[PDB]
């Protein structure tokens, strides 16, 4: 199915998916 290499499941779900910036809440 989803061959997502941890891309859409460990990253960017970060640096934005984390906080639109990475942190700063």
Swiss-Prot record:
This protein's GO CC annotations: extracellular region
Any one of the GO BP annotations: defense response to bacterium
Transmembrane segments: none
Keyword field contains Signal: yes
Major subcellular site: secreted
Alphabetical keyword list: Antibiotic, Antimicrobial, Secreted, Signal
Localization annotation: Secreted
Family: Belongs to the pleurocidin family.
Biological role: Antimicrobial peptide.
The protein's name: Pleurocidin-like peptide WF4
Origin species: Pseudopleuronectes americanus (Winter flounder)
Gene name of the record: ple4
Shown segment, full-protein numbering: 23 to 47 of 68
